[PDB]
Design a protein around this ligand. Structure first.
Ligand code: HEC
Ligand code: MSS
Lengths: 81, 373
């Protein structure tokens, strides 16, 4: 038989916010990786940082995220993290 | 209970338990990124397998491997393409061994000021181990490298969840790849590689940052041009200058791939606010570089106003952690301890931290405040 490896359960979650970008991030930002990538970034980095993060995911890594959602997500992130 | 806080902003992390591993600092889960608690480095020169740090880029890591079916393919600009079993590597080729540090490009990124994006690591994305395996030189010589070869690429069993995301593939120069020190490691600290450390085979690139050390390595391609894959072309780039640095907030004008380690050192037996008894205080730690040899470690108890020479421990090899010990007279009160290493080509550590956009290569003189009583 082959050897196998068992990972612990994933538990990482996004910080809830009333901004619509919270749900858009939940729906778009956990498809490739866990959201602890986001939760552990340096704090209060602001708009330009998070705008750049989102654009990199889309342009470089080919995250299928449309323009309206990309803005909602970056705005939610900049305000929340 | 089950969390720690690293000494930088937003530093809280879960302590997480993985098969074969002691509790480690959880950075990301999918894919796993696991940092080693600092205290581990005071436990001995060789980092135990169950403590060794873990770094991966893509979520499709292999979770079932049949070692008997596993094959290492050698292809491209070679006379005879090879398909090698683990049994072939162990039996048909001479074994070599090296004690070598693996350190991530971004080890200590969390301490970079101003803060930069990416893996927010403290100093625990490094470890030292005794690697055993086959010199890549021997396998390439068997295939027969052709004149005109320029680079060798390395790819493993992991892949992207979405096929448009670029595959993790790295390259080395042909002269580096065939140098005899670059190794196809099947063994780590006398055992098969832990799973998250690249079971059943990984590249070991002594003295080079961890990005090159391709895990779950199954595909080696000799090419007659420079590799232009994303993870060479765009990621893992440093400023093309002596300091591998820029003015904080500024992009470099030219870059090159990350390459050899710079000189690092740490005091391992004390941390911030530690109590020590006024008088002769025993200190110890580690130092390392890109393989030129640590020539000396100086130690200071007055924030670098004055230095005492540490005694270097007997060595395990030029690529290993080098242990050191010093005994310093400390008067009662607060003291800022520092250590600073230099290597045999005169590389050393800056007193003041530098910066680059990626937060790679940090090697500032480490300062630790203690209370002598
Ligand atoms: C697959 C197409 C992805 C989607 C969907 C999202 N991201 Fe991502 N992300 C992806 C990769 C290949 C990486 C690098 C992984 C590594 O370990 O190096 C990342 C990484 C991040 C990070 C860390 C910082 C960085 O590397 O730039 C962050 C903060 C991040 N990703 C955020 C993020 C957000 C907000 C997303 C929704 C738009 C998102 N990611 C989706 C690939 C993919
Ligand atoms: N295959 C693979 N390999 C690999 C990877 C991935 O992702 N994949 N990563 C890198 C990195 S990046 Mo930075 O520079 S660090 C690092 C390393 C780590 O190792 P460990 O995990 O064993 O510790 O690995 C290396 N290898």
């Amino acid at each position: 038989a082959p050897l196998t490896y068992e990972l612990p359960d994933e538990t990482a979650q996004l910080k809830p916010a009333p901004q619509p970008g919270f749900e858009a991030a939940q729906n778009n930002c956990a498809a490739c990786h866990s959201v602890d990538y986001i939760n552990t970034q340096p704090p209060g980095k602001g708009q330009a940082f998070w705008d750049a993060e989102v654009q990199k995911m889309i342009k470089v890594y080919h995250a299928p995220v449309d323009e309206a959602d990309a803005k909602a997500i970056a705005d939610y992130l900049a305000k929340t993290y | 209970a089950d969390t720690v806080t690293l000494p930088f902003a937003n530093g809280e992390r879960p302590l997480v338990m993985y098969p074969g591993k002691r509790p480690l600092i959880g950075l990301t889960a999918r894919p796993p990124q696991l940092e080693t608690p600092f205290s581990v480095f005071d436990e001995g020169l060789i980092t135990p397998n169950d403590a060794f740090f873990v770094r991966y880029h893509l979520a499709g890591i292999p979770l079932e491997i049949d070692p008997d079916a596993f094959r290492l393919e050698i292809k491209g600009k070679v006379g005879t393409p090879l398909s090698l079993s683990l049994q072939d590597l162990k039996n048909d080729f001479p074994a070599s061994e090296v004690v070598a540090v693996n350190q991530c490009s971004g080890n200590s990124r969390g301490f970079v000021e101003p803060r930069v994006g990416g893996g927010q690591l403290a100093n625990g994305a490094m470890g030292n181990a005794r690697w055993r395996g086959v010199p890549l030189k021997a396998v390439l010589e068997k295939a027969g490298v052709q004149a005109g070869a320029k680079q060798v690429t390395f790819g493993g069993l992991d892949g992207p969840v979405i096929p448009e995301t670029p595959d993790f593939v790295k390259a080395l120069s042909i002269d580096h790849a065939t140098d005899g020190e670059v190794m196809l490691a099947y063994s780590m600290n006398g055992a098969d590689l832990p799973w998250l450390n690249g079971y059943p085979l990984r590249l070991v690139v002594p003295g080079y940052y961890g990005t090159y050390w391709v895990k779950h390595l199954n595909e080696i391609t000799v090419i007659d041009k420079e590799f232009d894959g994303f993870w060479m072309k765009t990621a893992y780039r440093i400023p093309d200058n002596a300091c591998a640095c820029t003015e904080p907030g500024k992009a470099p004008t030219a870059t090159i791939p990350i390459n050899r380690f710079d000189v690092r050192s740490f005091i391992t037996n004390v941390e911030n606010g530690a109590s020590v008894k006024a008088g002769e205080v025993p200190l110890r730690g580690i130092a390392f570089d890109g393989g030129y040899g640590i020539t000396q470690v100086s130690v200071s108890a007055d924030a670098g106003k004055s230095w005492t020479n540490a005694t270097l421990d007997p060595g395990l090899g030029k690529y290993s952690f080098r242990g050191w010990k010093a005994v310093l007279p400390l008067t009662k009160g607060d003291h800022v301890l520092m250590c600073r290493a230099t290597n045999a080509r005169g590389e050393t550590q800056p007193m003041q931290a530098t910066w680059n956009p990626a937060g790679y290569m940090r090697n500032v003189v480490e300062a630790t405040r203690v209370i002598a009583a």
